[PDB]
Every structure is written in structure tokens, then in C-alpha cells.
Amino acid sequence: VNEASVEHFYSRAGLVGVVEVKDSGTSLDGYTVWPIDVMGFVQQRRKLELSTYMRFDAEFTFVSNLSNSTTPGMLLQYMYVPPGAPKPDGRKSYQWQTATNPSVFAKLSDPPPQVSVPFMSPATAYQWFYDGYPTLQYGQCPNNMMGHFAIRTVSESTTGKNVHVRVYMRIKHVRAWVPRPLRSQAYMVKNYPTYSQTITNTATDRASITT
Amino acid sequence: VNEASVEHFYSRAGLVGVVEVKDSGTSLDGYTVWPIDVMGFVQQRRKLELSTYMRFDAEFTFVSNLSNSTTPGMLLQYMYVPPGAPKPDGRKSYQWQTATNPSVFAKLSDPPPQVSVPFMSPATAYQWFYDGYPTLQYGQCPNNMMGHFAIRTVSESTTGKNVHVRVYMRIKHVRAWVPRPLRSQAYMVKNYPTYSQTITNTATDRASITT
Amino acid sequence: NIVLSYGEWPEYRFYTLSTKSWKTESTGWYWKFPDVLNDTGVFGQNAQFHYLYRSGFCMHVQCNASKFHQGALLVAAIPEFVIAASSPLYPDFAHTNPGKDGQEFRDPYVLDAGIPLSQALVFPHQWINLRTNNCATIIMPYVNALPFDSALNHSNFGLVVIPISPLKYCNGATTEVPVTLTIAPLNSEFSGL
Amino acid sequence: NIVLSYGEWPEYRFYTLSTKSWKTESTGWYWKFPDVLNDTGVFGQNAQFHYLYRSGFCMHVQCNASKFHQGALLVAAIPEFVIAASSPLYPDFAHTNPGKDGQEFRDPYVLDAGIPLSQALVFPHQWINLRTNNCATIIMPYVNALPFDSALNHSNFGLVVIPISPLKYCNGATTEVPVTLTIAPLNSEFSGL
Amino acid sequence: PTELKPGTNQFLTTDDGTSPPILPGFEPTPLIHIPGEFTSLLDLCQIETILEVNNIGVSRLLIPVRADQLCASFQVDPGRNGPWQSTMVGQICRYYTQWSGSLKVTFMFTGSFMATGKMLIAYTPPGSAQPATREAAMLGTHIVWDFGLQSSVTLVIPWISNTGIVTIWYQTNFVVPPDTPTEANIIALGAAQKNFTLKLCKDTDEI
Amino acid sequence: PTELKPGTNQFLTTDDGTSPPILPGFEPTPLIHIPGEFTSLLDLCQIETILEVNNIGVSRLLIPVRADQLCASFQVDPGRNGPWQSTMVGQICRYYTQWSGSLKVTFMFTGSFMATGKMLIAYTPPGSAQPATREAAMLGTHIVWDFGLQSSVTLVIPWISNTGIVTIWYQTNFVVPPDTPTEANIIALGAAQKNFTLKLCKDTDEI
Amino acid sequence: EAAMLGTHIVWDFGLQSSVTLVIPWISNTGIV
């Protein structure tokens, strides 16, 4: 009864993204910018597309460690660049100091940080299916973007160790609108519906209709 | 009075299993899957068989350390694969990312993690004695299985250290049904009643019945 | 009888589009509209001049065939209906805004959305079974995330007519069966002239 | 007097099985049943055809012997009674479903369950002491984890009769003592024909 | 100030809790009424959707009828595979582990208005093997459905917990006047009943 | 916010606490009535179970009677060893350290209906040595039990805290008509009383 | 066993020395 519900069907934390700062090797950057995308994995893309419209709050958790699993104390900054704000160029860029970008300072020895992101869209609800041109652009609604998370180790110059991060998002206070079928065809491109020319059948074949 | 009770007779935490991830040696796996079994030790098998039917909640605690007892900070994942879900193939398998398998991220420097597992059976209560064929299969009821715990260190490739885990389960909110004798004969095979052909006597011998 | 989409009345004249011939081999059609009426009528001039509008619709599909013809049609109204481009990528503008004369499905089975047609019954729908009934009627309230939007850019919903069971007739009968559509705007509003 | 197992009445005709001869050397018997009546009677055809059933039983053991015979029997009803296979492994199907003619214990001392016979008095039981009384009666309610189950696959309980104290008689007396069993199903139900 | 820390301390269980908001004072856009809200996944099951009984394209949804034979048969289990794999009820059952309840099936005869005939629609319990003759199929649960009188009929499968068989038998023959097409079709529509329920959770193997 | 951490902090004591559920929203299968529930281990003691007085198989449960001698004797302590090791009361006393209360013993004469005789059943306090003659055994606690009149008798051992001796003496002789078997048996049934109690805990050495 | 399923009475000597079986209606033949 209550175990199948739109509130309970979109519930538990799941892995949205996997990022790496990687300043050790030929890549000396020491920072990364990760756009917030709920559809990055095809199985969570398919569940969110059971609804045309959704309105929810987000819960982000950052599980971070080095490559050998050891978590020595070292200081990281998790910033949040809301939609419409410029993204850092480098580790020393002045765009890490902006007071309107909320940031979290937490060591790798601490429990994983977590924060809540309110509903960001100008429209009443996120719409995963948009028909028409907003202004290649067919079906592309700019209202959905939730912003970015920029992550860097706080250091003067070039620490030689790579940091692996895993982001866990949890949908909260979810409301859904008009129902929609579940996709039969395999996804191809990230943003669009386009499907391969070889149509695969929904139901599996048998010898004859008798049995 | 209250010190001998079915609630108080099955009570305190006890050692259900001892597992090792062992990625250091010729075994490079770095993960292990442990099926939840309350009867793994013969003395807790004998106490649970004082009842035919039981219904209870579980409490699992994971005490983990390296081989030399030192517990350096390193990140482990304890997942839980409920009955009916596929088990990880390897350390990098995609079955660690499934959102419906609850998992716990806790370092070796932390207090031991603990979680609670609800009553999982389709039947009203677990039945430790089943008569008849469900479909070798004699007395084998599939309804009892509680699932698995898959454990791995979170790392990119091959950390060279072995981790020893000890699992402590605690029976909660226990209800029991029709009483049964306590086994006299020694156990042989894990699942079945089968007993050795040499019958050992319950009461110890004396010279004569006079004294 | 009347089908009321999503149990809402569209609270806040009849346009007869040209007839389609449904031959035994035809694969179906979709009109995808606020759009069908943009280029026709007095409703079509309002849609050009005003910068925002809110409107519901009432649409009526009717099929003229004898008692010796047989077949069936599924008539559905699908909100935010988005067309996909089958690989060997983007759909052409003729497909994404077919006009008043509609477009004919390339793949009726996936509805060119990648979603299966078996489950298309989750949307507001009717059946035309040539023995049972010749007509289907659907009232569609205004569904959008915003209270107002643009008529030229955004298409609120499509209307889709798939011949699920092919048309059969004995020799001598009329080869094609006319299928005609009638749209009456309900409770339309405009702003920003 | 009557023994009511576990204080429950089985709320929601008489079948006389063939007679067993209890000789001085016999080791006892077990009928293990929903099963005894599967192959006999009108109850046996219901158990084949319906896919689920719920039933309680009433069973009556009676022993005909003179005043010069002596001995004793323990009569118990044991739920979920599971047979074990003694090493020099699985019990054969003849042992796990003995039928209407019952099976004879290999080891009466452990009841072939590995559990001791001394403590078998924890189950619903009676004594037949040939001087005191010739009969024992037990009413068994339906015990299961589920409200319904299958008659062919699952056996709810066994019935076990062990000659604890061997039979003795002087020369000239009848060598064997007949032991007969009578089963009346109480409050049986069926579904899924 | 006297607190102490038990064994459950300081780990991520990936299950519910509370967290501080990242932007305080941010006021999100207010709600408006949108139609078509659905609060449950048990009302998406109850709506009948075509089930694919023929194993070819859109022809896979239809069983043909031509002029005491078995027309078609299919099993009643939504979860596993086969026809129910194209229904909505069978696609959401792949997200859960265990479903229990009663089902529903509907047939529509698509042939001509002038055509007359009769069919036999039988159901078999989960334990039994399917009937090998229509006379054996008649003694069980069945409905005798006459085309000319009624164009659609409904068979309700009784309780089933997580499998039965539905067999369609020609009775009599498919009778047509002159100048009427001799072949027709039937579409089958499956749906959950009101008492259907879903349990545990799982990750679909469809994607 | 002012809290501080005392010396009891952050260890596993393997004793009671609370923990978060691993699956929220999971609804387990509801309860139904099952008969035969037992909430205590003191009511499993009160039920009489055969105790093994003869040291051979099922013959170990019986004391023979044949045609002023001591038939048999056994000590009354459930915990240690011997006859009480086969009772239910003596198997649960191996899980605890200390038991205190009163016991009960019952005898059943299995011989023929035509046989007549008499016995003497005596009990000795824990400090005394057992009687060497039936006349010394008579002066203490005893019951004189006549077969032909009564087939079963009960001896209640008074309070004992965590040991007495029960001795059975032939009085008179075992008298039988012609054509009646000359040997008989007696089974002994031990059980706890209503005031029996169990203390501490331990791990059985039986397994 | 075939005779048991029909009409029968099980008569114990030691308890009772005489028993009665009533044949139901017959019009002008059964077997005992």
C-alpha cells in the first residue's frame, strides 16, 4: 500500500556521479567542476521519465578518499555555483572567494559532508519532456539546470595526490504529474530521445502462439 | 522468573561469522560475500531448535581491524543484498551501485557500524523444521534466507592489506512456538538432521543400578 | 461517450480539418497541436499577434464506413509529445511541427518517441471499432508548468491516431475510409498584443 | 480421557486403517500425516484435485489384549516431524511418506530425528498401559506458519507409537496384540480445484 | 553535557535523515494547480494496456481468427516474460520482488458487423496442466462468448500470489455472409485488480 | 551544544541498545494466530519426562521387578549427571549456573493386571548417608505403594537449593497367579515443581 | 478396505456381545 508510492518509489540515496581532482600526474589542475545531473545513469533516467513534471528537494552527500582508500587529514572545499554564476578557471581563481557561492570546508578525516538544495526552477516544476524550441535546441529547456559543484584541495601549490569523490543524491518531498510509459528502446545520445534504427521487441519470442 | 524467558533466553550479542577480504596474497579479490546464517555455530543451532517457529528482528554489528590489531583510517563499504537480488562479481562490479541495496560507508577508525534487519520471511514466522518437499530438497524451505552482506574496501586497485571482520547478531522482539526436545546426537551435515550410526547415550554410565 | 482528460474541465466555433484517407496499408497520423490552428482562421491570427496565451481544446474524430468494412483505431491525446530521430541526430522541422495537414508515422510501434504503443493506453484515449462505433471525443484541459506560454514555440500536446488493426474489405467496397477531425477551442485567453 | 493438543479446538466420517501386530520384538511405527488419507476415500480425492487445504484431525488408537498380557505404549503427535538418515545423506521417499500402512522405526531411541525419546513427552501424548487402559485419543488442531498449504508436498505432523516397555505373556497366550488406528478429519477446507 | 557515543556512530547508511539548507532565505517559485497528479503506483496498474500475445511490428498485438481447435494460450504471470511484458502492470512488477493479488483480462473482437461466431475462454489453476481438448477445458472455469451479440468480454483471474493458463478454443465456426472478409482479430487487455499489492524492491533488468 | 564525553564513551558492550532500520517502509508479513506459543522456560520444566535410571538402547529407561532388598537408587540433583540428564528439567539446568526449588517424581508399574505386590520408596535429606536396611529407611520419609490397588504413585522431594537419595525397597514379594509373567517394569518420571527457579546463565557443555 | 468405504459397523467383542445392522429400504439385492 504505502510501499508503492510516488513518495516511496523515488527515495533512497544513489550514486549520481564519480569525479576526481587528479593533480598528481600530467594533469596538475587540482580542481574539478561537476554539473548537477540526475539522469547521468540510464536506470535513474528511466524512472524519472515515468512522470512528465516533478518538483523535489535534493540531498547531496560527498564520500571522498584517496586511491588506496586511506583518508588522511587534508582540507577540501566543496563549493556550489548556482545557476547563472561563473565557474572557476583554476585552483587559485578569485571565483572561489565569492560570498554568494555557498561552500563547505571539510577534511577527508570527517564524516561525509551533506547539504540540501532547494527547488531551483523558475517554472512550477521540472519538466523532463519539453516540446518546442526554447528561443539542436528542440526539446531543450534551460530551466532544469541545478548548478554546479566545484571541488578543490586547499593548498598553495601542487599537492601530489589524487582524490576520488562519489556523490549521493536523495530526492525529497517529491510530487509528480501526468504519467507516461516506460521506455522500451535503448538510449543512445544523452539529451535526446533518439533511438537506434533496429527496433527491438518488448516481449520475448516463442515458437508458436499455441505455446 | 523473568531471567528464564523466551525473550531473555535468546538475547545477547554473539559471534555469527568471521570473514576476511584478503586482497594481499595470491588472492587479490578485495571483497567478500557472506550469507546471513544464524546456525553457523552448533551451540546456537541447538538453542534455536528448542522452537519450531520463530519471528524476530536482527541487529548486526561489524567489528573490523587489520591483522596486527591496528585500525588505520581506510574506507570500507558494507552492503546488504536482500533475498532475491544478484551478488557482486568483483570489486569494481556495477552491483555495488544499485540504489535498492542499502550500504554503509564507515572507516576502520570509527566505532563498529550497526544496522537492523526486519523480519524477511513470506511466511508468518521462520520455521527451522520443515517436513516435505518444497517443489536433496527434503526439509529445505527457501523462505528462511535473510540475504547477504557484501564487504569491500573502496579503492581503485589492489591495496595490499587484509581486513578481518567479526559479525555480532542480536535477536530482538522474539516470539516462539511449539516446543521441541534438545538434540542428543552430534550434528554432522550442516542443513540436515542426519546423525552418526554410533548411538551415544544421553545419561552417563555407572557400575550398577544400586549405585 | 465523452472522454474528459484527467478529470478536469478546461475552465479558467468548430474547425473542420481536411479528411484523411485510411487505406489498408496506412500507418497512422499525429497532429501535435496548439499548432494546427496557428495558420487558419481567426484563432490563427490571435496566435500570431499576442505574446502569451492559455487555451484548452475539444477534439472530435469521426469515421465514415459501412457495415462490410472492419478495423480499429486507437485515438490518444499525449501531453508534451516529443519526436525522436531514428539513427542511421535531430528530427526535421516538418516532423516536429507538421501543420494543419498532420504527419504520418514512420514507426507506429514506438510512436517515434521510443516508448511502446502497448502502453499508450495510459494517456487519455478512445477506441474506434468500426462495428461498435464510428466516433471518439476528447476534452483536453490546459496542462503546462506555467500559467501562460507561447503558441508558435511550444506545443502543449499531440493527438495521435493509430490503426491498430488493419482495414479489410471484400472486393467492390470503397478502398479507403475517410477520417475527419474537428477542433473547437475552449476557454482561450491571450495577452501581450 | 480426551487429549486436546495445545488447548485449541480445530475450529475454523471415521477411517479405520489396517491393524498392526505388536509382537514382543517390534520397534514401533509412525504414520506422518495429512498423507495417510491422500490415497483412500473421498478425502483422498479432494486432496488430489484442490490446490490448497486446511484441516484438523482427531485420531484414536486402540489396543485389544487380555488381562494376562502386559506392556506399555507411548502415543505422541509431533508437528513438523522430520526423518534423518543415519550415516554409514538422505532418507528415501518410502521413509519420508510411508503411506497408509505406516513405517517401522529403525532407531526407536532417537525417533530417527536425532532427538531423545525420553523428552518426547513434551509433545501431546498419551499412555496405553495394558493394565490401566486400552485406548488413547488425541485431537490435533491445524498448526502451520501459513493459513493454507499443499496436501501432497507438506506433512503437518506425524503420529508416533513406541512400545516403551516390551510385550510379555505366558505360553499359550496369543503371540501378537492387534493395534488399530481411526482417523476422523475435523473442519477440513479446500480451494483451487 | 554527559553524552556518550554508542556503536551506531558516524557512518553513512544511505537512508533518511536531515541536513541544513544550502541557500537560506531563497524563496522557490510557488505552487500552481497542474492536472494529472498521481500519488501511487497501484493506480497505474489498474488501467488496461494491450498485452502482446503473438510471439513483425504492430502485428504482434493481435490474435487472428479464421474460418474444436485451440486458437491461442498464454500464462497469467505478469513478472516473468511473454505477453505480460508489454503491459504496464508487468513493467512495474519488474521493479519489485513479490506481487500478490488478482488480475483481469479483456478481449475485443475487431471483425465485421455481419460476422457471427462463438468462442470458449478457459482458465486453469496453477497446479494443473492445460486442457488437451475443449471438453476437458469446459468442465473447469470458462466463459462462452458470442461475437454477434457482444463485442467484448472480461475474464477475472482469481487470487494468485507471485501460474495459471488462459486458453481460447474455437466453438462452432466463424460464419459470414457473402461479401464479408473472412479473417478477423482479437486484442487482449490486461490489468491489475483493486486488491493487487507490491512488496520489497528491486532494480529492473529491462534497462 | 555544551555536551562533553565521559569515560563510558564509544565502545561495544555487546548489550542492549537501538539501531536504525536497514529497509524503511518495508512492511513485514502480518501476524496470524499459531497455537502452542510458550513465553517461558519454567513451564517446559514442569512437564514430566522419563528419566534414565538404568545406567542397551530403549531398555535404559526401565527398572526391572522380579520374584527386603534394594531395587534401585538415584540422586535427586538435576544438574550434575546420571538419570536426570535425560529429563527436560535437567537439560535446561545445564544452561544456568544455579537452580533452587522443589522437585517431583512419579512411578508407573507396567506389569500384569493379575500381579500383586508392594514396594517401599524412601527419601533421604542431603546431609545423611543412604539407609543400609529397609528398617532404617522406614523411619525417615517414605511411601508404601501397593501395585494391585494403584498403578502410579508420586513422591515430592521438598526444597533443595542447587543432594538427596531416593531408594526403592522390596517389601513383601511379587505375587502372581498361574500363567502370568513373572517380571515387570517401572518407569520414573521427573519434573520441576511450581516454585522452581533458575539463576544466572551459562553455556551448555552438552554440545 | 473397499468394504470400509461403504456402510459398515466396527464391532468389538470384549466391549459388546451383540450388535444390530439395519438394512435400509428394499423393494422386492444387497449383500452383508
Numbering used by the authors:
A (entry chain A), B (entry chain A): 75 to 209, 219 to 294
C (entry chain B), D (entry chain B): 30 to 41, 62 to 137, 146 to 250
E (entry chain C), F (entry chain C): 3 to 57, 62 to 73, 78 to 172, 189 to 233
G (entry chain C): 145 to 172, 189 to 192
Article, verbatim:
Although highly effective vaccines exist for EV71, no vaccine is available for the global public health threats imposed by CVA6, which underscores the critical need for developing an effective vaccine. Here, we demonstrate the isolation of two stable CVA6 particles with excellent natural antigenicity: one empty (CVA6 procapsid) and the other infectious (CVA6 A-particle). The cryoEM structures of the CVA6 procapsid, A-particle, and A-particle-1D5 immune-complex we report here reveal atomic resolution details about molecular determinants in CVA6 related to virus neutralization, cell binding, and RNA release.
These characteristics are all consistent with this band being composed of purified procasids. The density maps of the procapsid and A-particle reveal essentially identical (0.96 correlation coefficient), pseudo T = 3 icosahedral capsid structures, which explains why the two particles share similar antigenicity. The obvious difference between two density maps is the density of genomic RNA, which is present in A-particles but absent in procapsids. Though the procapsid was shown by SDS–PAGE to contain VP0 (containing the sequences of VP2 and VP4), only the VP0 sequence corresponding to VP2 is well resolved in the density map and hence successfully modeled, indicating the one corresponding to VP4 is flexible as that in previously reported EV71 procapsid. The first 70 residues at the N-terminus of VP1 are missing in both models; The AB loop of VP2 in the A-particle contains a flexible segment of 10 a.a., but 20 a.a. in the procapsid; In VP3, one small segment (a.a.74–77) is missing in the procapsid, whereas the corresponding segment in the A-particle is intact.
